[PDB]
Design an enzyme around this catalytic site. Structure first.
Site, PDB file in Angstrom:
ATOM      1  N   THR A  37       0.833  -1.193   0.000  1.00 19.75           N
ATOM      2  CA  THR A  37       0.000   0.000   0.000  1.00 19.75           C
ATOM      3  C   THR A  37       0.871   1.247   0.000  1.00 19.75           C
ATOM      4  O   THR A  37       0.606   2.201  -0.729  1.00 19.75           O
ATOM      5  CB  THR A  37      -0.890   0.053   1.260  1.00 19.75           C
ATOM      6  OG1 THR A  37      -0.071  -0.131   2.419  1.00 19.75           O
ATOM      7  CG2 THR A  37      -1.959  -1.021   1.215  1.00 19.75           C
TER       8      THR A  37
ATOM      9  N   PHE B 122      -8.120   5.366   3.981  1.00 23.33           N
ATOM     10  CA  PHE B 122      -7.677   4.587   5.140  1.00 23.33           C
ATOM     11  C   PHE B 122      -8.778   3.877   5.924  1.00 23.33           C
ATOM     12  O   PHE B 122      -8.586   3.547   7.089  1.00 23.33           O
ATOM     13  CB  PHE B 122      -6.875   5.468   6.100  1.00 23.33           C
ATOM     14  CG  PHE B 122      -5.617   6.002   5.511  1.00 23.33           C
ATOM     15  CD1 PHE B 122      -4.501   5.184   5.370  1.00 23.33           C
ATOM     16  CD2 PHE B 122      -5.538   7.320   5.085  1.00 23.33           C
ATOM     17  CE1 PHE B 122      -3.321   5.680   4.810  1.00 23.33           C
ATOM     18  CE2 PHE B 122      -4.368   7.827   4.527  1.00 23.33           C
ATOM     19  CZ  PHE B 122      -3.258   7.003   4.389  1.00 23.33           C
TER      20      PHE B 122
ATOM     21  N   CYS C 134      -7.115   2.352   9.240  1.00 21.42           N
ATOM     22  CA  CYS C 134      -5.704   2.022   9.229  1.00 21.42           C
ATOM     23  C   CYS C 134      -4.963   2.574  10.437  1.00 21.42           C
ATOM     24  O   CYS C 134      -4.866   3.794  10.600  1.00 21.42           O
ATOM     25  CB  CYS C 134      -5.073   2.572   7.942  1.00 21.42           C
ATOM     26  SG  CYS C 134      -3.367   2.047   7.750  1.00 21.42           S
TER      27      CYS C 134
HETATM   28  C1  HEM Z   1      -0.685   4.609   2.300  1.00 22.79           C
HETATM   29  C2  HEM Z   1      -0.827   3.336   2.752  1.00 22.79           C
HETATM   30  C3  HEM Z   1      -1.907   2.725   3.384  1.00 22.79           C
HETATM   31  C4  HEM Z   1      -3.228   2.605   2.965  1.00 22.79           C
HETATM   32  C5  HEM Z   1      -3.884   3.199   1.690  1.00 22.79           C
HETATM   33  C6  HEM Z   1      -3.856   1.739   3.983  1.00 22.79           C
HETATM   34  C7  HEM Z   1      -5.208   1.416   4.005  1.00 22.79           C
HETATM   35  C8  HEM Z   1      -5.901   0.706   4.976  1.00 22.79           C
HETATM   36  C9  HEM Z   1      -7.321   0.386   4.936  1.00 22.79           C
HETATM   37  C10 HEM Z   1      -8.310   0.697   3.844  1.00 22.79           C
HETATM   38  C11 HEM Z   1      -7.584  -0.333   6.024  1.00 22.79           C
HETATM   39  C12 HEM Z   1      -8.946  -0.867   6.440  1.00 22.79           C
HETATM   40  C13 HEM Z   1      -9.252  -2.257   5.913  1.00 22.79           C
HETATM   41  C14 HEM Z   1     -10.652  -2.737   6.264  1.00 22.79           C
HETATM   42  O1  HEM Z   1     -11.483  -1.927   6.720  1.00 22.79           O
HETATM   43  O2  HEM Z   1     -10.937  -3.931   6.058  1.00 22.79           O
HETATM   44  C15 HEM Z   1      -6.342  -0.487   6.741  1.00 22.79           C
HETATM   45  C16 HEM Z   1      -6.208  -1.182   7.944  1.00 22.79           C
HETATM   46  C17 HEM Z   1      -4.995  -1.359   8.608  1.00 22.79           C
HETATM   47  N1  HEM Z   1      -3.748  -0.903   8.119  1.00 22.79           N
HETATM   48 FE1  HEM Z   1      -3.372   0.283   6.591  1.00 22.79          FE
HETATM   49  N2  HEM Z   1      -2.957   1.336   4.975  1.00 22.79           N
HETATM   50  C18 HEM Z   1      -1.726   1.914   4.602  1.00 22.79           C
HETATM   51  C19 HEM Z   1      -0.493   1.753   5.301  1.00 22.79           C
HETATM   52  C20 HEM Z   1      -0.327   0.995   6.469  1.00 22.79           C
HETATM   53  C21 HEM Z   1       0.949   0.772   7.204  1.00 22.79           C
HETATM   54  C22 HEM Z   1       2.370   1.372   6.964  1.00 22.79           C
HETATM   55  C23 HEM Z   1       0.653  -0.106   8.189  1.00 22.79           C
HETATM   56  C24 HEM Z   1       1.526  -0.808   9.023  1.00 22.79           C
HETATM   57  C25 HEM Z   1       2.480  -0.332   9.862  1.00 22.79           C
HETATM   58  C26 HEM Z   1      -0.767  -0.392   8.098  1.00 22.79           C
HETATM   59  C27 HEM Z   1      -1.443  -1.212   9.013  1.00 22.79           C
HETATM   60  C28 HEM Z   1      -2.824  -1.434   9.029  1.00 22.79           C
HETATM   61  C29 HEM Z   1      -3.513  -2.213  10.061  1.00 22.79           C
HETATM   62  C30 HEM Z   1      -2.802  -3.167  11.029  1.00 22.79           C
HETATM   63  C31 HEM Z   1      -4.854  -2.112   9.851  1.00 22.79           C
HETATM   64  C32 HEM Z   1      -5.978  -2.687  10.735  1.00 22.79           C
HETATM   65  C33 HEM Z   1      -6.452  -1.758  11.860  1.00 22.79           C
HETATM   66  C34 HEM Z   1      -7.517  -2.397  12.745  1.00 22.79           C
HETATM   67  O3  HEM Z   1      -8.571  -2.785  12.215  1.00 22.79           O
HETATM   68  O4  HEM Z   1      -7.297  -2.519  13.971  1.00 22.79           O
HETATM   69  N3  HEM Z   1      -1.383   0.284   7.047  1.00 22.79           N
HETATM   70  N4  HEM Z   1      -5.294   0.165   6.088  1.00 22.79           N
END
Ligand code: HEM
Length: 455
Positions: free
Chosen positions: A268, A393, A400
């Site tokens: 991502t 996000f 996220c």
């Molecule tokens: C620009 C980059 C990023 C985008 C576009 C992005 C996008 C997202 C989205 C859409 C979700 C929600 C998924 C859902 O609702 O099913 C999510 C969840 C998450 N993302 Fe990201 N993400 C990015 C970068 C990161 C990074 C660097 C990390 C890790 C260090 C990360 C860790 C997570 C985690 C662990 C969740 C789950 C949170 C929870 O439900 O407790 N993401 N992300």
């Protein structure tokens, strides 16, 4: 009102399944979205999904008292190796709340000051690689950005160095990870477990998992045996306790958390940096404003945490690229109880909705008529933007956790690239969006001429 729900063509008992039997499903769904409108029923043999593309309907889907995060089919597959990490857990699972409470403060914008130096380390390795290319060689944008993100998450996550800029063949772990993710994605378009896959694939799949589990487990064991206190996410998880149960995270969950940071954050974030560079190189005037800000702010050989936060316009560039092509294209939601959405479409308890983020960002009603144009200025005043219209996000307590981490790194790196090099789109690249769990410009190549500024 127009209350009946449309649907694309079906293939008998196979239903609309064949409709996404392509290497670019989300982009195909976007076409169907254009035709059918802000909501359509997509049916598969034993699964029904409703895709939302309108801000009108999506702001209602984001109402947490009525809808909660659902684990889509793909996420359930990913759970085979990511276990009960933040990303593949249900909101009602005890390990979700626990990890969420403990990790929340470690992912704040304030906590980025502690990770900054480690992000700078890998960022300098990238600049220097590019500085040392012989003038006639080119850059494989997506490939380098991925090396950049994997190494950064590895260093910040568990103080491990994958050393991707020293090898062609990635570290075995990385290899087993991309392979497991691939398998998990292929399972989604499997006609059935015996068309394609057979024992050979599942065997390979179980093998990659061991490679991943073994490395992370060992590292966890070694750290609590030596009692080292580094500034990585692992230290915070070993010394952390939930303010609610007073309980700490178990070693297995901690493992899943690390694996989760890697699978959820690397592609991502690498995709984001690639797209932004693409739009910048395709839009000479935007690149000029950005490059000028970068040179004006980043007046030191190495960027300070304070300086990264002043790259105002660069941030706008990232947000605009996130609008046009959200690297994580969709998220699923389920109805907690029966309700009617938008006052027209009735929904029953448990019905799955799927937010089509790329379509949400093209809502002329919210963004105007030039939705397809790359214009960073539209984020000049973020507060002027409607609620739930910009969702790269996710939503609510399930958004996220790594949002701050990603944006800070993307800003740091973009700022440094714009300060040290002039980019040439020597091939007049034509955008080709490759799809996996995420989106990325496949085959994007550029050539960089150094401004010869020292680090
Ligand atoms: C620009 C980059 C990023 C985008 C576009 C992005 C996008 C997202 C989205 C859409 C979700 C929600 C998924 C859902 O609702 O099913 C999510 C969840 C998450 N993302 Fe990201 N993400 C990015 C970068 C990161 C990074 C660097 C990390 C890790 C260090 C990360 C860790 C997570 C985690 C662990 C969740 C789950 C949170 C929870 O439900 O407790 N993401 N992300």
């Amino acid at each position: 009102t127009i209350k009946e729900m449309p649907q694309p063509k079906t293939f008998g008992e196979l239903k609309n399944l064949p409709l996404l039997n392509t290497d670019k499903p989300v982009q195909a769904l976007m076409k169907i979205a254009d035709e059918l409108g802000e909501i359509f029923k997509f049916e598969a043999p034993g699964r029904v999904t409703r895709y939302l593309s309108s801000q009108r309907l999506i702001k209602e889907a984001c109402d947490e008292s009525r809808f909660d995060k659902n684990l889509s089919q793909a996420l359930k597959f990913v759970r085979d190796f990511a276990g009960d990490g933040l990303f593949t857990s249900w909101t009602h699972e005890k390990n979700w709340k626990k990890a969420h409470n403990i990790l929340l403060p470690s992912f704040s914008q304030q906590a980025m000051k502690g990770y900054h130096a480690m992000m700078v380390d890998i960022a300098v390795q990238l600049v220097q690689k590019w500085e040392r290319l012989n003038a006639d060689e080119h850059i494989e944008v997506p490939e380098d950005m991925t090396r950049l993100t994997l190494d950064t998450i590895g260093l910040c996550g568990f103080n491990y160095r994958f050393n991707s800029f020293y090898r062609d063949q990635p570290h075995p772990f990385i290899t087993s990870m991309v392979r497991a993710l691939d398998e998990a994605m292929n399972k989604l378009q499997r006609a059935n477990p015996d068309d394609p896959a057979y024992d050979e694939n599942k065997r390979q799949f179980q093998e990659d998992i061991k490679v991943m589990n073994d490395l992370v487990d060992k590292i966890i064991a070694d750290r609590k045996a030596s009692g080292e206190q580094s500034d990585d996410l692992l230290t915070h998880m070993l010394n952390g306790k939930d303010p609610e149960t007073g309980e700490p995270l178990d070693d297995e969950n901690i493992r899943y958390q690390i694996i989760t940071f890697l699978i959820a954050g690397h592609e991502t974030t690498s995709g984001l940096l690639s797209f932004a560079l693409y739009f910048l190189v395709k839009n000479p005037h935007v690149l000029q404003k950005a490059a000028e800000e970068a040179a004006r702010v980043l007046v030191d050989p190495v960027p300070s945490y304070k300086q990264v936060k002043q790259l105002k316009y660069v941030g706008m560039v990232l947000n605009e690229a996130l609008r046009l092509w959200p690297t994580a294209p969709a998220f699923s939601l389920y109805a907690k109880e029966d309700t009617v959405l938008g006052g027209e479409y009735p929904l029953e308890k448990g019905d799955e909705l799927m937010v089509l983020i790329p379509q949400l960002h093209r809502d002329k009603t919210i963004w105007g008529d030039d939705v397809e144009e790359f214009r960073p200025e539209r984020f000049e005043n973020p507060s002027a933007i409607p609620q739930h219209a910009f969702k790269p996000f996710g939503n609510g307590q399930r958004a996220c956790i790594g949002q701050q981490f990603a944006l800070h790194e993307a800003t740091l790196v973009l700022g440094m690239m714009l300060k040290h090099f002039d980019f040439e789109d020597h091939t007049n690249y034509e955008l080709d969006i490759k799809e996996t769990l995420t989106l990325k410009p496949e085959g994007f190549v550029v050539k960089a001429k150094s401004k010869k500024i020292p680090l």
